[PDB]
Nucleic acid binder design. Structure first.
Ligand SMILES: [Zn+2]
Ligand SMILES: [Zn+2]
Lengths: 97, 179, 303, 52, 201, 215, 365, 88
DNA sequence: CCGTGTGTGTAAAGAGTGAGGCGTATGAGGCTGTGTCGGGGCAGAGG
DNA sequence: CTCTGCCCCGACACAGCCTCATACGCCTCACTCTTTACACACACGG
């Protein structure tokens, strides 16, 4: 899917696979099928493991759309997760449908 | 009367003079819109003049949203400069204003029924389709959307003088049909 | 004789008629105010919105963020009224939970073999060989046979052993509409709803065995009591049956100190002819509302 | 509640008609007043021909 | 050129409209096919627009939704082709008045003739009194019929009127509230009813 | 439930007498046994609720825009209901601030017109402290009316209009320098004002009667 | 200002309660109408003279008015009217369908709760309420303890007294949230009970028409409204021009509020109750005349009482979560069953679970 | 809630790649050490997510995002949806 | 003659749906304009 | 009888107004059988 392999979790996946392949005990194929099935599993769970409502307000600084991927950059944003507030100076939202 | 329309939209076109790769502009522009499965142009939005520019691969850009011709031209030049900074040989050739749409209020309710009855050859009033009367002015090729609340929208004009003359031509008729 | 009399008479006539208009226009203003009141009644409109979210956005519908006092209260493990909200398990909910667990286990067992078959097919697509391709085809046939065997797995061996890690949170997502949390569903399935828990009506011999085991091994290790009972029962069920058939649960005999305490509680907590006994029983040790009712009506009221 | 609405609206029309009639009365009364002013000016002008 | 006159006859059959309207529709189709100022438009849309124009001319106009309810195309293209045909033929069609749509709307409903006349008077006196400025005559007719039914012996709630006239119940509510306070004076002076006109929903 | 009708009947049977004396209300009360409206086995809670409802109904009938006769009948009904209550803590009539001035002026009119019976009843209701001086008539959570025409036009009003008109005509006749004819500058006076107002008022009366007559 | 309707029959205009009381007392100034005294041939003459003076009539006229205007149970009822006939039919149906015909618990509860203190004379003779004190029949919405509270919102009515400083009602509103005990007693249930939530979190605030009256009386109290106002100042929120106060320098008379309009009362962090002023009336002589206990409860909802899930004989003392024995997650036990199930002989936490003290909302509220 | 989500994802991924690990010829010890290194390595604000409806008003953007992950202030949060508002 | 074992009244939950008002969002309209992709007659072999 | 390529179209924005008409949905109300709870009562048996 090439979207969710960028967070802390996906970065950990990539780094662990890199360390394992550099140790000469797995093949790059097994690594890439593992990555693909990780993408599938995170897509399934992330859309099926969660219900916490959030609502964010801010001043949209910039936005972009290409090849079915939206890229927004917002400034002075506040995210409202369940009974708690997170204030961030700048946030980037990357969506892919 | 002493009231004159205030322009709400101005649509203009210009030829950049060189073919463009819309994918590169979408990937490098700050506020571009590009959905090739949805449309065949890149829609770029800016804040200073509050205008939207549709740029086509052939190099022809269409700017809309400007409230007067000066701002339309400035926005078109801004878009041309932005495209130039992206590594394209874009110029400013054949800048033309294609439409000038304005709104106004005569400040009195109007009887649309009688207006269309006495001006059938020009006006077309279909309440089921549109609750506004559509008067096809003939001296300047301008279309008038007249509503019972008094709001009158002038559209299809190429220059501001056309808008003013069309409103001055239609105002006496509306006054004669004052509700 | 002179119009001056006409002037003054017309002045007074205009004055009286203008007073008439003053009264009439005040009536008109009152009537139009009444009409405006009626229109706003037609345009009028509530309490429910202001129950938890007294302040709610006109855009999103969310309340103000947690305060420092609220965060401190949550840190101390003090439950909000919603957390302590308990709802009964309906029969349709139980059947849905069973079917959902079956489906979840089926999916979990199928996913590995399904991905193995997909990998075998992908390798077959680019193998650049024939004998290796036939070997891969044989492996794919074996994988398909394993998938078929998994699909035809019976429900008894599929459910589990009431202690295996299911993805219960899934049960709260697709099958349930979010009304039940994952923890609630998993506890209900593991402790009560699993077929490995004997829900059949208790027998007299089973009750006698339970009582004997509780008396001997003690009434304070009910897990080992359920294990030793022989029949597949939960400690909760055994304790429930013991208590419902116990005789030391209630004192069943009144004392002078208990009578004084009951009288003091009643006199303190009365509001007139109404005596809420369930609320009195809270401070009463080992008593039921019926016993308090009987004692206060028969032996603690002058007649 | 529409019964009260119709009673109120009919009273409203009643008092509007009364106001219209009386406003015609005042307009014609003021026309008469202006006529009186003009006539009294003209008449009082007939004895100002002999003054100190 | 063929398969459209058959289509026009089928279109008319579903409405049970007299044959003269069908002949006028066929003639209009012939003229527009001679002009070919709208060649790109589908033949079915042209036929539907011609049918609507013919119905309007004879004095028994229908609504675009009742031509779409029988046709295989959406109201949008019906209106587009209507305007295109009006422009191409350099012809004119009289404005639709509320008086046209009660003789049919009340006929589909089971209301008596007395309620028909009552609703007609209500809608008319509403339109001259400017109580419904710049609103579609169909919605005004629906509201008048709603008043006539609620006040009369036979009561119809908003859903039936919306389905018959093809007007959203919210539009009926708005057009009824707008003329709501002036209900009594709109009724005929000599009008019998079992529910007082002084109380209504 | 459905007590309103009964009260209405009483009010009707009072206004049909065209009398203001409290004695007539007393015979009506005795004949209809209205005092037994509270009689009957019924517990304290619903008893006080029913008394509250009856008192509120009587009080709202006592306030405008009801006729003077109906208002006096409602006052007598209030007195009888409050004085005949089976609740030990007699329920009190809820009186709002916006209505206190109107009730005071009604009492002033009653005493001025020598209707000492109703005035004494109202004074007694004040003395025994039967009024809860609330902010609004009801707890907030979540006929024979009077028309404006009589206040506008009546017998004395039109009588003095026509007297002024006749005096105006006489003074027109005497003002003119010549007794033969009045001046041509002052001939606009209308005689249809009385006719016009009569037509308008009779139109209203006709509408009212054809309204209250069922179809 | 005069109390007048904003909504047809749903809400009034914002007006000063003090001005309302001043208007009422001035319109009833020295009329013999504000007494607060118990109801009491020689007096007949004085009454006749007073009637003559007030009504401008003769002494004989006063005497005959007194005589004619004189006052003018038995379960049997005949010659029934409409309402009386309906009542007779209802009693007949009840007699033919009911067998005990005794006052049900709810009705007696409501009656004795409303009439708990009516005409109760004070003992000190020094806490007199002045002649006209603007008693407010406020109501506090019960917090949602059961899921069905949303369908029907329960409330408790309180006859507050005018001119009483705020924090007099806040200290009187009885809510179970103030008796909650924090901490986890899973390891051992014999720990010294932690100070109830009433002590740890003394902060609370009222909100009446855009004004946050905060309970800053005690040092442990913090500005609860601060968050909200800050969260309102960040962006356009549909709420603007928030005010603040101290809640100790204000009285109910000073409040400028509407009747029947939702207002807020927050306490214990986020426990929110809806304050609605049903009506404001001058104190009569037939109601409670005290001040020490006048801020009492006129009505309470009588919430349900949770019971131990093991045995339904007793109420709930402990609430367990993530229990290895209980079927449900939030399982309610009494002391007996909780000790019997969650511990061993020598004393140790058997299994895995989180047990906390549970105060029954149906007992302290 | 994020740590439990991550643990569940780890469990699922390792469990359903066990079959590939067995088939291709790598022992399960490699699988479990992969797991352990995965949790061990687990310990700019960017939101990677899915968009359900990016509504554009005249200048107000109403963002109806579906489920997604955010990396705010160095702390990872998860949402099922995001109905946000912004002004350009 | 004082125990208990079931009955009863009637408001209070519990889901269990089912309805309804209103707020918001959307469409429809000419406007003039630019790429492009489906597609609706069109006769035309081809059997 | 049955496809079948082919040039001449319609339809996507999105620019800003403007009124009416249409549709979605979302929170809250209704009520209704069905239990649910708590006080009180009536036997009940030797
Ligand atoms: Zn509380
Ligand atoms: Zn227990």
């Amino acid at each position: 899917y090439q979207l969710y392999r960028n967070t802390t979790l996906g970065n950990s996946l990539q780094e662990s696979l890199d360390e394992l392949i550099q140790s000469q005990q797995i093949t790059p194929q097994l690594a890439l099928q593992v990555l693909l099935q990780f993408d599938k599993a995170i897509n399934a769970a992330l859309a099926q493991r969660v219900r916490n409502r959030v609502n964010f307000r801010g001043s949209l600084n910039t936005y972009r759309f290409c090849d079915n991927v939206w890229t927004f950059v917002l400034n002075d944003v506040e995210f409202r997760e369940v009974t708690e507030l997170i204030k961030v100076d700048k946030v980037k939202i990357v969506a892919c449908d | 009367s002493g009231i004159v329309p205030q322009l709400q939209n101005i649509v203009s076109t210009v030829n950049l003079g060189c073919k463009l790769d819309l994918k590169t502009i979408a990937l490098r522009a700050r506020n571009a819109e590009y959905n090739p499965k949805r449309f065949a142009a890149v829609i770029m939005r800016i804040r200073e003049p509050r205008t939207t520019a549709l740029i086509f691969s052939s190099g022809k850009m269409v700017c809309t949203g400007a409230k007067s011709e000066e701002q339309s031209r400035l926005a078109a030049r801004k878009y041309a400069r932005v495209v130039q900074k992206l590594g394209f040989p874009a110029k400013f050739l054949d800048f033309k204003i294609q439409n000038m749409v304005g709104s106004c209020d005569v400040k009195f309710p109007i009887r649309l029924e009688g207006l269309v009855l006495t001006h059938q050859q020009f006006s077309s009033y279909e309440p089921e389709l549109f609750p506004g009367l559509i008067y096809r002015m003939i001296k300047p090729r301008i279309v008038l959307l007249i509503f019972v609340s008094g709001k009158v929208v002038l559209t299809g004009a190429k220059v501001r003088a056309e808008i003013y003359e069309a409103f001055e031509n239609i105002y006496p008729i509306l006054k004669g049909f004052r509700k | 004789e002179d119009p001056e009399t006409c002037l003054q008479l017309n002045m007074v006539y205009q004055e009286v008629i203008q007073e008439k208009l003053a009264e009439a226009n005040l009536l008109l203003a009152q009537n139009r105010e009444q009409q405006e009141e009626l229109m706003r009644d037609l345009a009028g409109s509530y309490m429910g919105h202001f129950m938890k979210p007294y302040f709610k956005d006109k855009v999103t519908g969310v309340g103000p963020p947690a305060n420092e006092d609220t965060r401190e209260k949550a840190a101390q493990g003090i439950k909000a009224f919603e957390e302590l909200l308990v709802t009964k398990w309906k029969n349709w909910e139980k059947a849905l939970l069973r079917k959902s667990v079956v489906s979840d286990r089926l999916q979990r067992l199928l996913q590995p073999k399904l991905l193995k078959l997909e990998y075998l097919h992908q390798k077959q697509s680019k193998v650049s060989s024939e004998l290796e391709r036939q070997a891969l085809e044989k492996q794919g046939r074996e994988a398909e046979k394993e998938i078929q065997d998994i699909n035809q797995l019976p429900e008894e061996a599929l459910l589990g052993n009431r202690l295996d890690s299911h993805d219960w949170e899934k049960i709260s997502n697709i099958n349930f509409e979010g009304s039940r949390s994952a923890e609630e569903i998993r506890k209900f399935w593991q402790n009560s709803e699993h077929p490995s828990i004997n829900k059949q009506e208790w027998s007299r011999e089973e009750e006698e065995r339970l009582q004997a085991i509780a008396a001997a091994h003690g009434h304070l290790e009910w897990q080992k009591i359920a294990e030793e009972l022989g029949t597949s029962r939960s400690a909760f069920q055994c304790l429930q049956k013991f208590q419902q058939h116990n005789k030391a649960l209630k004192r069943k005999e009144w004392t002078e100190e208990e009578d004084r305490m009951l009288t003091q509680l009643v006199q303190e907590m009365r509001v007139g002819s109404h005596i809420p006994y369930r609320r009195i029983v809270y401070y009463m040790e080992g008593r039921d509302s019926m016993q308090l009712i009987y004692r206060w009506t028969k032996s603690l009221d002058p007649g | 509640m529409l019964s009260r609405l119709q009673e109120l609206r009919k009273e409203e029309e009643t008092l509007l008609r009364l106001k219209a009639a009386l406003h015609d009365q005042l307009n014609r009364l003021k026309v008469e007043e202006l006529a009186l002013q003009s006539m009294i000016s003209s008449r009082r002008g007939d004895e100002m021909l002999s003054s100190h | 050129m063929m398969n459209a006159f058959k289509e026009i006859t089928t279109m008319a059959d579903r409405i049970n409209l007299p044959r003269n309207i069908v002949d006028r529709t066929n003639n209009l189709f012939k003229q527009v096919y001679e002009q070919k100022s709208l060649k790109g438009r589908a033949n079915d849309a042209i036929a539907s627009a011609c049918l609507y124009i013919a119905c309007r001319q004879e004095g028994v106009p229908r609504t675009f939704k009742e031509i779409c309810a029988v046709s295989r195309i959406s109201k949008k293209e019906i209106g587009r082709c209507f305007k295109l045909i009006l422009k191409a033929l350099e012809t004119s069609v009289d404005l639709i008045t509320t008086g046209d749509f009660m003789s049919r709307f009340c006929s589909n409903l089971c209301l008596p003739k007395q309620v028909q006349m009552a609703a007609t008077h209500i809608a008319r006196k509403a339109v001259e009194l400017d109580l419904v400025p710049g609103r579609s005559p169909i919605s005004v007719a629906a509201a008048a019929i709603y008043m006539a039914s609620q006040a009369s012996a036979e009561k119809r709630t908003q859903k039936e009127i919306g389905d018959i006239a093809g007007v959203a119940d919210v539009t009926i509510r708005q057009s009824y509230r707008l003329i709501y306070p002036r209900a009594p004076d709109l009724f005929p002076t000599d009008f019998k009813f079992d529910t007082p006109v002084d109380k209504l929903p | 439930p459905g007590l309103q009708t009964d009260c209405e009947a009483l009010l009707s049977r009072f206004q049909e007498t065209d009398s203001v004396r409290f004695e007539d209300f007393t015979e009506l009360w005795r004949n209809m046994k209205f005092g037994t409206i509270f009689c009957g086995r019924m517990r304290n809670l619903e008893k006080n609720m029913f008394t509250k409802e009856a008192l509120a109904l009587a009080w709202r009938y006592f306030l405008p825009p009801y006729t003077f006769q109906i208002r006096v009948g409602a006052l007598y009904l209030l007195y009888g209901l409050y004085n005949t209550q089976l609740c030990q803590p007699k329920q009190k009539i809820r009186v709002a601030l916006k209505d206190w001035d109107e009730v005071l002026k009604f009492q002033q009119d009653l005493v001025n017109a020598q209707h000492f019976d109703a005035a004494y009843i109202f004074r007694k209701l004040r003395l025994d402290r039967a009024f809860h001086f609330t902010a609004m008539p009801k707890l907030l959570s979540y006929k024979d009316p009077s028309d404006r025409v009589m206040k506008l036009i009546t017998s004395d009003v039109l009588e003095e209009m026509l007297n002024v008109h006749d005096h105006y005509q006489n003074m027109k006749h005497v003002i003119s320098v010549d007794k033969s004819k009045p001046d041509k500058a002052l001939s606009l006076i209308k005689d249809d004002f009385f006719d016009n107002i009569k037509n308008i008022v009779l139109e209203h009366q006709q509408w009212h009667k054809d309204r209250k007559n069922p179809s | 200002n005069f109390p007048e309707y904003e909504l047809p029959e749903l809400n009034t205009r914002a007006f000063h309660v003090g001005a309302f009381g001043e208007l009422w007392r001035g319109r009833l100034r020295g009329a013999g109408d504000l007494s607060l005294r118990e109801p009491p041939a020689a007096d007949s003459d004085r009454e006749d003279a007073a009637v003559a003076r007030d009504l401008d009539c003769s002494l004989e006229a006063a005497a005959e008015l007194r005589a004619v205007c004189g006052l003018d149970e038995v379960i049997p009822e005949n010659t029934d009217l409409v309402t009386l006939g309906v009542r007779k039919r209802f009693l007949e149906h009840r007699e033919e369908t009911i067998t005990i015909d005794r006052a049900c618990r709810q009705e007696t509860f409501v009656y004795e709760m409303e009439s708990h203190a009516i005409g109760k004379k004070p003992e000190n003779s020094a806490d007199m309420i002045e002649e006209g004190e603007l008693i407010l029949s406020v109501n506090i919405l019960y917090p949602v303890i059961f899921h069905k509270h949303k369908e029907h919102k329960p409330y408790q009515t309180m006859l507050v007294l005018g001119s009483q400083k705020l924090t007099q009602l806040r200290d009187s509103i009885r809510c179970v949230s103030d008796l909650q005990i924090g901490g986890e007693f899973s390891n051992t249930p014999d720990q010294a009970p932690e100070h109830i939530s009433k002590d740890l979190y003394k902060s609370a605030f009222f909100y009446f028409e855009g004004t946050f009256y905060n309970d800053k009386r005690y040092p442990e109290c913090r500005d609860l409204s601060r968050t909200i106002i800050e969260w309102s100042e960040s962006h356009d929120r549909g709420y603007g021009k928030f005010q603040t106060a101290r809640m100790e320098d204000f009285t109910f008379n000073d409040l400028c509020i509407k009747l029947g309009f939702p207002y807020l009362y927050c306490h214990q962090g986020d426990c929110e109750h809806v304050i609605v002023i049903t009506d404001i009336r001058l104190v009569h002589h037939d109601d409670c005349l005290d001040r020490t206990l006048y801020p009492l409860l006129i009505k309470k909802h009588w919430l349900w009482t949770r019971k131990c899930f093991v045995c339904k004989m007793y109420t709930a003392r402990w609430v367990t979560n993530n229990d290895s024995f209980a079927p449900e997650d939030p399982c309610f036990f009494c002391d007996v069953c909780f000790r019997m199930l969650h511990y061993d002989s020598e004393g140790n936490k058997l299994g895995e679970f989180l047990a906390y003290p549970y105060v029954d909302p149906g007992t302290f509220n | 809630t994020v740590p439990k989500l991550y643990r569940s994802v780890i469990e699922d991924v390792i469990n359903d790649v066990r079959d590939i690990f067995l088939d291709d010829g790598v022992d399960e010890q490699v699988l479990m050490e992969l797991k352990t290194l995965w949790e061990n390595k687990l310990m700019e604000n960017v939101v990677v997510c899915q968009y359900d409806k990016i509504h554009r008003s005249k200048n107000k953007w109403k963002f109806h995002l579906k489920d997604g992950i955010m990396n705010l202030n160095g702390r990872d949060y998860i949402f099922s949806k995001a109905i946000g508002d912004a002004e350009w």
